[PDB]
Design a protein around this ligand. Sequence first.
Ligand SMILES: CCCc1cc(C(=O)c2ccc(-c3ccccc3)cc2)ccc1OCCCN1CCCc2c(OC(C)(C)C(=O)O)cccc21
Lengths: 271, 271
Amino acid sequence: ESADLRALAKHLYDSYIKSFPLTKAKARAILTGKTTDKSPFVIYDMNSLMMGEDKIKFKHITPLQEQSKEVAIRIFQGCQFRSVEAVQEITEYAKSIPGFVNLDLNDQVTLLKYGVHEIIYTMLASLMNKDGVLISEGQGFMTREFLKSLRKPFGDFMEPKFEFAVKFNALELDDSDLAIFIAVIILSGDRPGLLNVKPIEDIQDNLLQALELQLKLNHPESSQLFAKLLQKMTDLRQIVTEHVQLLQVIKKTETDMSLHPLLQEIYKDLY
Amino acid sequence: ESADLRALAKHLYDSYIKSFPLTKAKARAILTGKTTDKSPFVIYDMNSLMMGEDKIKFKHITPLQEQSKEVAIRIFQGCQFRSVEAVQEITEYAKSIPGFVNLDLNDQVTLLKYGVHEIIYTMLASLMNKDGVLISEGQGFMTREFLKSLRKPFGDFMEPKFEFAVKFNALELDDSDLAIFIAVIILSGDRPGLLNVKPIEDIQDNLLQALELQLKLNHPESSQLFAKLLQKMTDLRQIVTEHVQLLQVIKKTETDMSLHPLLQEIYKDLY
Ligand SMILES: CCCc1cc(C(=O)c2ccc(-c3ccccc3)cc2)ccc1OCCCN1CCCc2c(OC(C)(C)C(=O)O)cccc21
């Protein structure tokens, strides 16, 4: 029923505000200059990278860990710490999706293990434009061209996220749209190894109707936006399959890699 | 007006019904036997627990989880699971408390973070008699004797809850009283790290007013029941500190991990 779906939508948005400190609206205010506080330091090369860390003089122990390597490894290493925080944030949000915590525990685990990267790329787009990406709570900006320039495999991790972002961003979703899209991703009844598919699909279906109504109301002039958004779920899946192949390239071409423990769990025997 | 205070009580009883499908009225019927028809499986020992494990598996699988560990640890993990579910119900009931969703978003989160435990023990009492507690939406009944017999750290967890429940249950609160009492507890202006204290005390003051009038009307022969009930709100703080201090034992001294990343961030600065 409409009132039910509108109230589902407001719940997820409210909870999305509570779970994700840097929302699209705040990322864009920062991207755009509209903010009034502190303009982000841009990293375009080795020297400004050095200075970007070396900002640690009127800056602090930047929540990540410590670095005994080179540029390409060090950047991939700062990506891991951020994706670990994103996973925590996304798990905290999932628990608020009505019906999620009442599911079989193994199913909750599998839903998260498969959904979490799709959602990291979805929301990474929020922080991106065609020239670069906001990093460190919006205190920095790394250029697309710098990330793309990185030695073979590392450089290969970056570009396809930017090509995705540019296209997803042209859909002009805002946070309240995104909040339902991401819950829809989480509640995917076709993740490998699910014990109890139907009660997951029943929830997804109801999220789907809510996302539908939210796009009609919020973007009345935008034709077939709902479909165009669900088409994006396959751009997402292909980013993940690509990312995973690139991860295998990293075991071969690199010395001691071993991701953060929680990410190794995520990647352990994945699709 | 008193009529506005009655309308508030009434509005709160209605949200409460919606949020919490197993009510005190329903649970007391099951602990006794009103229209005696669909009796919970009783779990009184280690054998009956297994008999009752693969009883909800001689049907299917939506579990807290199956045989894969030590029994005292499975029971304690099953409680954690139930308590992550219960935080979702409380969270929703809170949105229906007037003024709550207009509070600072961060204060909302802090009110729930610290109010939630006190509310879980208050509501657990509705499911308990002197001899046992209804579990799994009222389908099981686990005996206090059996909980008490588990090995030394786990054998002491539930017992303080039973002792509180017996003293609390002797007050003979119904759901309509508890709906108000639960709302007073949430709106406690003394939780650590509250930004705006005053607006919270102003809502709690109108809840206190409604609570006081409810009990005066519903329980005219209980002299000073308002007061005895506020006094219970110290008895609860103490169960909660003792519970929080027993989570330090488990974490420091026990091997098994398979915990819930929603309670674990909740115990920062907690009494
Ligand atoms: C979800 C994380 C996305 C992401 C995060 C950041 C940062 O937080 C960051 C912050 C600080 C530094 C830094 C490091 C050294 C000196 C100065 C600054 C570097 C990076 C910077 C760029 C960035 O995205 C660009 C492309 C996204 N990307 C490509 C590299 C691998 C990767 C990724 O890989 C790991 C292995 C973490 C994974 O599978 O989870 C996960 C999600 C995105 C992603």
